[PDB]
Design a protein around this ligand. Structure first.
Ligand SMILES: CCCCCCCCCCCCC/C=C/[C@H](O)[C@H](N)CO
Ligand SMILES: CCCCCCCCCCCCC/C=C/[C@H](O)[C@H](N)CO
Lengths: 285, 59, 251, 178, 251, 114, 59, 57, 178
């Protein structure tokens, strides 16, 4: 069985031919105080020829604008160390630490989608005076812990049994791992801004950190090895799909300060020029 | 076999592709890149009384 | 009823306080037709490159201002492709839309007359003398009337009561005209067809019509209102035609 | 004025000021300082190519007793910017009459040899300039302020589109946790 | 069969010894249509004031002449209203009819090649150098090829065998071309449509095509025949269009 | 276009040789004009949030991807007899019209005692 | 499933192949190697008045 | 669903048989000054046999 | 003459020169110096095999008062090249009469034992030679030049094809950035 699905492309409006005019219709006179943006075209104000316009607004839809992988976390962890906590990496999930993806998402008040998550993992031989060995290929374990789950204490903790938590095992030299995640929030959409408190007496935690609560990620080596020290770096990439967004907002002007707040330093509106009339000369011998 | 055949993106002045779904969850499907709708009047014309644009705004 | 928009070429004029439009003698501009033509070569019709609004220089309406005039054409001989087409051809033809602008507050007072005069032949301030071309026109700059009798060689007798023509100025209402009453409106608009005794003519040799702007009631205001009140002219040719292409002339 | 509201206000006043130009700027919606942080410029800076017509709206915020007329002109590229009302008179223009309707719209139409221009504009993809002049002048009665201001809004028309996504140069960081 | 007449505007060319006419790629000039346009303003179409024959300056074909070339446009930027329209607009579009004339008696001998080359990008006679605009074109005056290798700063490497482009000159027949064989005919005629990768372009910045005239068989005569034998070019634009009116540019 | 990359590596000449390195990984990033430019191998710009990149490991098949027709004109131009500036000067010929970004390539391991 | 079956290149003196498109963009499709058209008169015969080739060219 | 697409191969022209001739038709005389390339074949200038040509461009 | 236009001109003159041969060359459209940089040879040098008939056009560029007749002959391979008009008379030939029509076409027909010949021709895939002789001679009146020139054009017929793509040996470099 085959089923045909028809795709409708949406191109932009043509311009219609227009001649001289002398009447009482005044398309150019408006009143911004109403809150209304004028819908005038060149054909209302000048004389125009007929043009058949074939351009399409395909690459400025929300799905094409947002469906691209972006880094959201980087971390390191060693094969051997004397700290017992530098042998695995762990973090709390969000998209607030790398500014590009954050600012892109923050043009909208509310968002809802599924995700495709990719990991990129690299390793390196630590600097030392004595180098040279023969190690087998290294293997890595990634475990996701929803809130309330038991937390690992070390790299040999029983919690790495992963009986109910989803995990990925991976070997160096293969293609980067990947998996997809559905829309998981107790609300009807994710919230990027929250002007409220965590406690009913209007105090406690302010803003974003009240609502997110989406678990943690832990990553370790599996070999339990390395006569000579080595270091690994893990990076996480997010790509949203099946997207919907609501309530557009003006884009961020000031530079970000931290991941918990919207705090900022006052910044100028733009950069200056010599004069309100200044425009540079470019047609000179 | 539950195949879908739809048209490819081309230009203006043999063009279709086929797809099969393999997984049991729809959150595993590929992105929806070929839907192009708009409703700009929601943000540009949010007024109660309609404004004709050939007539004066007030009076 | 008071709002108006006019579009020509790539130019557009809006106004919110207009009165009406005057079509000179009920005749709109139009192209020359076959049963009225004499010149035989096929003519050129640029049609958006020439038929558009050009804005001249402004004047300052002071408490003691007698008035101003311009000559058409030759006020537009340096305006883009209209002027360039004028330089290269022997014969030309066109009508016009004229728009005069002057705004002021509801605490000022004054009254201007705006009139178009075909074939406004002028007299010299020396009775047995003749005028120079410079005395009749300074291009896009306006000539100025006087409040008393004038002297000097080759200059126009320009006392405002005789309008440079030996008539009573209060009779100029026989011509196409409007008024700008500062309490009523802020702009005047006149549409003028081609008016001559031959179907085409040379645009350097012959002034087709004169635009005159004369305050009848002087500008007046009180304690700390604005003192600077300018007047602006804007003219657009319509149905422009040219015949007789040769090398460019030079004045 | 980069950190005050006066950055948005264009000043005008009564008296004989016909020789003085009101304002002028280049048409570079994604590169010039005047336009790059408005909503339209912010959207454009995520892309590499743009095409379409642009709308500029002008609103007069003087007292109800001030009158006047202005000339708003746009010049396609190929020549230097006009230095007088007479030269600017030859381009694409509109004569705005201040009245009970307080707003006038100048539309910049798409006049270009290519289908698209670069968001990072160069000499080859230039688009021209806009200038403003006194057509008559501002006249007021006694007991009214003599200086006033005009404001300007920008938006895109219904033939407008962009393409070739890219990262924006307006946001940055030195390390994680930002 | 050998007689021909061509009329454009107020100009007419006759000839009694022509061969045929070459339509560059079987495509006649035409105006830009709606499903291929990008610029939005209404264009001007002068249509008899620009589409007519202009004659350039002649050259003298001597016994040792390597050849000549011209660049189009910019060879017609001072030709009447065509040039004036070029000065005032940002975008222009036009095709052309080119006519080359050279007559001689039945006792002379020689052979010329007449070829039109789109986008003839040229090289400098200093390998790590670049050309000046003056070296590519002198307006209505022709540039001259050389018979040996050239030197000098900013000048074009103009030895006639490489045609300034690094190719074999005997292959230039891939382009639109005719021959003038002194025993056969006395004129060549080429009709060239608008050829670019965009629908319109700026007429000062971009040379659309180069006209090259190269003698393959040198001029030769005997005892007391005429010694002076000139060559003349005449070009007429066709379907001319302009967009983007503003103030006049200056070089 | 269909674009393919071929990447090879070699141990630099020296007096002391011999080590045990894991397989090397490579990153290729394309930057359209106007994008931020990397300054070093640890620059933040390698985040590649919006630029397309390829990551690859030695020993596998050569990478490949396809690119559509990307030019602001209706066709690519191989010859251009014109200038960049309206006064008939500036840059002559081909380099006026191309403007199609840059390519950057780095190692990912950040490694190599030798 | 939106398959295409077309003939293979063979000689003169079981021969067809099948193809499926997998990607959403047509710029991902394979090359178009089996289209053989010509119009040489564009370059060899670019004249206004037709020349018969059995008749003399001039006169 | 299957869809058949037919490919047309374009082979070169055959040569036609030709015998003696004595007439006023002059296929061999031309004039290059026109800018025209002559479309003559061997069958216009010599005697030829019939060949079925199977070569493809 | 390798850097002058005289390389294209074949010389002829009046008087008794019947014993002198006008020109002769091998038929090797992709290998011989005479043919390898013409348009046809340039196209062939991207390929390994060719097949088909070839057209040679000859044009006379003397004064309108010169008359004469020439013999144009083509010899298939297997023997040495003719040394006299009588021997060349036995091959495939045409007798060209100079008149108001100034151009004559000699067609070289495909006579070969194989379907294709090598672009890099050897003894086995040879194709023969072309030669030219005075059939009568050039006669002129008083007051006219006595020496004249002939030119020659090459092209391919409508039965022509190539195959087996390869790289060309006419372009090269020593390092990048060239
Ligand atoms: C075994 C490997 C499993 C990998 C687990 C990755 C799960 C990531 C948590 C799922 C929720 C992420 C969806 C997006 C979160 C925020 O709502 C958005 N960044 C915007 O608010
Ligand atoms: C992540 C790897 C991406 C690889 C990026 C490769 C993109 C290459 C630039 C695309 C444009 C190339 C198309 C051809 C360019 C020129 O027009 C032609 N060489 C002829 O002019």
């Amino acid at each position: 069985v085959v089923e045909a699905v028809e795709n409708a492309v949406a191109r932009v409006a043509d311009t219609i031919s227009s001649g001289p005019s002398n009447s009482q219709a005044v398309p150019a006179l408006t009143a911004v105080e109403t809150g209304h943006t004028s819908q005038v075209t060149p054909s209302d104000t000048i004389q125009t020829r007929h043009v058949r316009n074939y351009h399409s607004r395909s690459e400025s839809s929300i799905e094409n604008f947002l469906c691209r992988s972006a880094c959201v976390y980087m971390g390191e962890y060693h094969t051997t160390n004397t700290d017992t906590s530098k042998l695995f990496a762990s973090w709390t999930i969000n998209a607030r630490r790398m500014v590009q993806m954050r600012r892109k998402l923050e043009l909208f008040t509310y968002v809802r989608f599924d995700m495709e998550v990719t990991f990129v993992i690299t390793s390196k031989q630590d600097q030392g005076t004595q180098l040279g060995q023969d190690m087998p290929p290294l293997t890595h374990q990634i475990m996701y812990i929803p809130p309330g789950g038991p937390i690992p204490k070390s790299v040999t903790d029983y919690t790495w049994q992963t009986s109910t938590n989803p995990s990925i095992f991976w070997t160096e030299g293969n293609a980067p791992p990947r998996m997809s995640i559905p829309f998981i929030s107790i609300g009807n959409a994710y919230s990027n801004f929250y002007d409220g408190w965590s406690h009913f007496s209007q105090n406690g935690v302010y803003g974003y950190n009240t609502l997110n609560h989406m678990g943690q990620i832990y990553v370790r080596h599996v070999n339990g090895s390395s006569p000579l020290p080595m270091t690994s770096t893990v990076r996480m990439y997010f790509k949203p799909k099946h997207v919907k967004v609501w309530v557009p907002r003006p884009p961020r002007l000031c530079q970000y300060k931290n991941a918990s707040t919207v705090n900022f330093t006052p910044t100028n509106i733009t950069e200056k020029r010599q004069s309100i009339n200044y425009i540079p000369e470019t047609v000179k011998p | 076999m539950g195949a879908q055949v739809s048209t490819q993106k081309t230009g203006a002045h043999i063009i279709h592709y086929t797809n099969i779904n393999y997984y049991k969850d729809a959150a595993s499907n590929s992105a929806n890149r070929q839907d192009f709708s708009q409703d700009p009047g929601k943000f540009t014309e949010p007024v109660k009384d309609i404004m004709v644009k050939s007539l004066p705004a007030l009076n | 009823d008071r709002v108006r928009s006019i579009t020509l070429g790539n130019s557009t004029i809006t106004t919110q306080e207009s009165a009406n439009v005057v079509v000179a003698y009920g005749r709109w501009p139009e192209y020359l037709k076959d049963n009225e033509a004499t010149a035989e070569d096929q003519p050129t019709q640029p049609d958006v490159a020439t038929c558009r609004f050009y804005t001249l220089e402004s004047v300052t309406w002071e408490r003691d201002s007698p008035g101003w005039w311009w000559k058409f054409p030759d006020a537009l001989k340096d305006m883009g492709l209209f002027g360039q087409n004028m330089y290269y051809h022997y014969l030309g033809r066109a009508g016009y839309t004229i728009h005069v602008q002057c705004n002021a507050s509801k605490f000022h007072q004054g009254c201007l007359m705006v009139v178009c005069v075909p074939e406004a032949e002028m007299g010299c301030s020396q009775v047995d003398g003749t005028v120079n071309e410079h005395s009749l026109s300074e291009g896009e700059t306006a000539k100025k009337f006087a409040s008393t009798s004038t002297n000097g060689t080759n200059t126009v007798q320009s006392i405002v009561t005789n309008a440079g023509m030996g008539v009573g100025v209060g009779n100029l209402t026989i011509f196409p005209h409007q008024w700008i009453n500062l309490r009523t409106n802020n702009c005047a608009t006149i549409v003028m067809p081609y008016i001559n005794n031959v179907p085409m003519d040379n645009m350097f040799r012959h002034h087709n019509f004169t635009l005159m702007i004369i305050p009848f009631v002087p500008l007046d205001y009180s304690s700390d209102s604005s003192t600077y009140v300018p007047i602006t002219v804007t003219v657009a040719p319509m149905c422009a035609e040219y015949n007789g292409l040769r090398l460019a002339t030079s004045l | 004025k980069l950190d005050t509201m006066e950055i948005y206000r264009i000043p005008v006043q009564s008296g004989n000021h016909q020789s003085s130009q009101v304002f002028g700027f280049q048409v570079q919606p994604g590169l010039d300082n005047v336009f790059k942080h408005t909503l339209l410029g912010e959207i454009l800076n995520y892309y590499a190519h743009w095409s379409g017509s642009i709308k500029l709206t002008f609103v007069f915020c003087g007292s109800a007793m001030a009158t006047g007329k202005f000339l708003l002109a746009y010049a396609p590229p190929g020549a230097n910017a006009p230095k007088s009302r007479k030269d600017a008179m030859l381009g694409t223009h509109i004569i705005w009459d201040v009245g009970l309707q307080s707003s006038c719209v100048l539309c910049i139409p798409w006049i270009s040899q290519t289908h698209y221009r670069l968001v990072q504009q160069d000499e080859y993809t230039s688009a021209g300039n806009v200038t403003c002049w006194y057509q008559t002048g501002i006249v007021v009665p006694a007991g009214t302020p003599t200086s006033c201001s005009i404001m300007c809004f920008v938006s895109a028309c219904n033939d407008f589109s962009v393409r070739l996504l890219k990262d924006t140069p307006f946001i940055e960081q030195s390390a994680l946790l930002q």
